[PDB]
Design a protein around this ligand. Sequence first.
Ligand SMILES: COC[C@]12C[C@](C(N)=O)(CN1C(=O)Cc1ccccc1OC)C2
Ligand SMILES: [Zn+2]
Length: 139
Amino acid sequence: SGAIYVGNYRVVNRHLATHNDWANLVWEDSSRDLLVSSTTAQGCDTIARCDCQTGVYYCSSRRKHYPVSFSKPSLIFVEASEYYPARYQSHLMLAVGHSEPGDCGGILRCQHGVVGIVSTGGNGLVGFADVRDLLWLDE
Ligand SMILES: COC[C@]12C[C@](C(N)=O)(CN1C(=O)Cc1ccccc1OC)C2
Ligand SMILES: [Zn+2]
């Protein structure tokens, strides 16, 4: 679990969005595993606008933060799950690091701010859904 709170928006993994997120929907993209909903309270986070390929992410299954080197956002095949059919997930960045399914939502940050959230993993890999291209989050 986890969310980014920026301005009057809440960013979550689309597969973990609540009934309230869908009732206050702003934008969603099944191919990116992202959903953004509107909020009444002003957010606590700032979004990075950069090309960093290193950062630190929060891993809830270890209660710890880990440093990572990750690939640029790209189209990567993701096996079928209870949430999605077998498909290519876009704007995904992979790195070597621990992750379990419940780690989705953990924030990845660089020195400039929030980069993305955990969305995939397995076998010593962790995948993050990028949010740096969503310029409208800032206004
Ligand atoms: C239970 O499946 C949830 C989803 C489907 C997902 C999607 N983006 O399509 C991928 N999932 C995974 O669970 C992948 C996974 C497997 C092993 C370890 C960690 C890990 O994710 C953090 C999110
Ligand atoms: Zn950066």
